[PDB]
Design a protein around this ligand. Structure first.
Ligand SMILES: [Mg+2]
Ligand SMILES: [Mg+2]
Ligand SMILES: [Mg+2]
Ligand SMILES: [Mg+2]
Ligand SMILES: [Mg+2]
Ligand SMILES: [Mg+2]
Ligand SMILES: [Mg+2]
Ligand SMILES: [Mg+2]
Ligand SMILES: [Mg+2]
Ligand SMILES: [Mg+2]
Ligand SMILES: [Mg+2]
Ligand SMILES: [Mg+2]
Ligand SMILES: [Mg+2]
Ligand SMILES: [Mg+2]
Ligand SMILES: [Mg+2]
Ligand SMILES: [Mg+2]
Ligand SMILES: [Zn+2]
Lengths: 91, 69, 99
RNA sequence: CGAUGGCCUCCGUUGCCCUCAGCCGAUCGAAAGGGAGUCGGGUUCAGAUCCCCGAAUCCGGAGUGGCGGAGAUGGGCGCCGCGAGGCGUCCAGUGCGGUAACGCGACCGAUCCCGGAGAAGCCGGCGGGAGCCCCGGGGAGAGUUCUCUUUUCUUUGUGAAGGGCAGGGCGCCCUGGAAUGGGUUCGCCCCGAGAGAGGGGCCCGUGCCUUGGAAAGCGUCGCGGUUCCGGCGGCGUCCGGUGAGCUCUCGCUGGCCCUUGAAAAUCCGGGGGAGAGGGUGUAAAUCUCGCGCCGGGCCGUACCCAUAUCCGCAGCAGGUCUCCAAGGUGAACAGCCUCUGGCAUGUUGGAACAAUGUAGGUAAGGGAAGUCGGCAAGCCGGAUCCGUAACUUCGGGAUAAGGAUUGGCUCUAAGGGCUGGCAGCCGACUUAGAACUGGUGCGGACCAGGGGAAUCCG
């Protein structure tokens, strides 16, 4: 059954800290605790160990990433731009 | 403590210079020969009886023997 | 399978303050087998009187401590508790001695 | 290179030269952190892991190493001998087994380099093993016996260190290749980066058996020393079953972190391959294997550890860090009663039972009229079954509010394991329904929320 109608993971916070703060931390908590797909071994075992540590359960490979998500928009744009600079510098 | 399971190595350890004394324990269904060496106490257990008292005269003469009564 | 027990009230009978008769019928009334005290529950358990030697024989499981409990009850009933005492000489045996 | 001693052999002792190379900084800092290795029985007026008895164990040392075993003793050729076996030449020999995980009693090796252990948070769930508790019996000794009670109570074992076997775990290996997806947990989770299914390997084995070890301990009965005695004797120390039970411990697994939860001493493995041994034997160098020899110095150790051995001026109702933890009721380490153990009412007793106090109670009718103010006291209270509003940040409010039931006794039904749609044998607490019954009494003691409508502030 559907236990709660519009509050998700932050239902653990009861009636504290305010609705706007709770719904602001909701998405971050969901992303932080979500399991991602390891780009190396293909398994869905990329779990966050600490702030910016993403370890693979079976692949046994750990990656530096965002604080709440595996990747960050700034990082992916930076990587793409730096790849373009690399290829353009040597043509 | 160390258990000796075959007959002759018990005499082999009995005739060692280290050995001090051998004591004979006679309980029901078992006969135990305990030889006291420097490091361990070696126990040899005989189930029957006739092997026991035909071995009782096979120990070296110079080794002290004590019957536990 | 045979169970065999003996009671030795020789000291008090030779002293002359109690006799083995009342002892024996106390047994053959108040021995209960599967909880029934009638007629020894049949011939399953047998009682024999020797010269101050009470012998109980059976094949159904029986309790030496049952026998001790019954003789203690007799001693209390006939007022010998502060004089006599029931002990065990060896296995399958009890005997009554003074203090 | 130079000198010495010991059968100047071979080595030791130096003195000089060549060569080799970091320190994270002298040193101090924990009687709860790290830190090899001792347990059982007995003994005193007062000490025991310290004394005695008996079993062990760690570290360190040893010219000649004390000794076994390993390194190890094979093959080829020419021979002798009928063969067995024995001669003369060459060649090897720093171990061997398993496809693999890895195994075997050892199995050379320096400077150097790499790694491991030491060395890691909090919480949750589950499983294994012990100790304890519990149930049914056999003994031994006690208690009740006015009536009954195969009754009630106590007791009924084995150390460390080895060996073996259960039992737990494995993110270890081999065969094979799976959708009609499968395996599996309380939850999860796992799989072509190899699942299920077979067969193995490793680790922990604190449990059981055995060596220790019955010789000792203990429980009973009886003899001694008329005593000063580790006195001497008989018997026994047995068979089972269960549990979301409690405590400890081991293991698996998960959750939380803008928290990621010590260092060093010390020890070990590996990579390398500088060196050393002997020319076929009396084999040598070398051995983390078995046994044997010697030693372990210094300091603390009594007792109290708390309503009387500490600090509060004191035998002060204060304060002062920890381990062990039975039965019943009950959710419970709550409250109440009891067992092992302990104590003598807390720096005095006797006789009276006035007032006023201090601490508990009960009151007809009324029910806050008392008082600044329901201060104090009182009401409610557990559990089961119904029901639960405004408002809301949608999570709550909420045990909202408001109702009914609750004892005793006799039954019925449902909820499981093991062995050989069924049959037999065992079984642990639950839940529901019914009848009967009591002077309407039943969360009978104990434990145990009064409620509602609003305003202000945070
Ligand atoms: Mg220091
Ligand atoms: Mg220390
Ligand atoms: Mg498999
Ligand atoms: Mg004995
Ligand atoms: Mg002390
Ligand atoms: Mg008083
Ligand atoms: Mg007093
Ligand atoms: Mg006092
Ligand atoms: Mg006082
Ligand atoms: Mg009134
Ligand atoms: Mg009234
Ligand atoms: Mg007034
Ligand atoms: Mg009040
Ligand atoms: Mg309200
Ligand atoms: Mg207002
Ligand atoms: Mg506040
Ligand atoms: Zn991966």
């Amino acid at each position: 059954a559907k236990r709660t109608k519009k509050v998700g993971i932050v239902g653990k916070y009861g009636t504290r800290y305010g609705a706007s703060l709770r719904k602001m931390v909701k998405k971050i908590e969901i992303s932080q605790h979500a399991k991602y797909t390891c780009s190396f071994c293909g398994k869905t075992k990329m779990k966050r160990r600490a702030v910016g540590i993403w370890h693979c359960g079976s692949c046994m490979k750990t990656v530096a990433g965002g604080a709440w998500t595996y990747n960050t928009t700034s990082a992916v744009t930076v990587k793409s731009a730096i790849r373009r600079l690399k290829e353009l510098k040597d043509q | 403590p160390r258990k000796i399971e075959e007959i002759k190595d018990f005499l082999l350890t009995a005739r060692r210079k280290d050995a001090k004394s051998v004591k004979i324990k006679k309980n029901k269904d078992n006969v135990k020969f305990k030889v006291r060496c420097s490091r361990y106490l070696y126990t040899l257990v005989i189930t029957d009886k006739e092997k026991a008292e035909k071995l009782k005269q096979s120990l070296p003469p110079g080794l002290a023997v004590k019957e536990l009564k | 399978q045979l169970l065999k027990f003996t009671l030795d009230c020789t000291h008090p009978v030779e002293d002359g303050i109690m006799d083995a008769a009342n002892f024996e019928q106390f047994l053959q009334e108040r021995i209960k087998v599967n909880g029934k005290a009638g007629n020894l529950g049949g011939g399953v358990v047998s009682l024999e009187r020797s010269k101050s030697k009470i012998t109980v024989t059976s094949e159904v499981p029986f309790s030496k401590r049952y026998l001790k409990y019954l003789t203690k009850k007799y001693l209390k009933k006939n007022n010998l508790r502060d004089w006599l005492r029931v002990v065990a000489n060896t296995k399958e045996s009890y005997e009554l001695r003074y203090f």
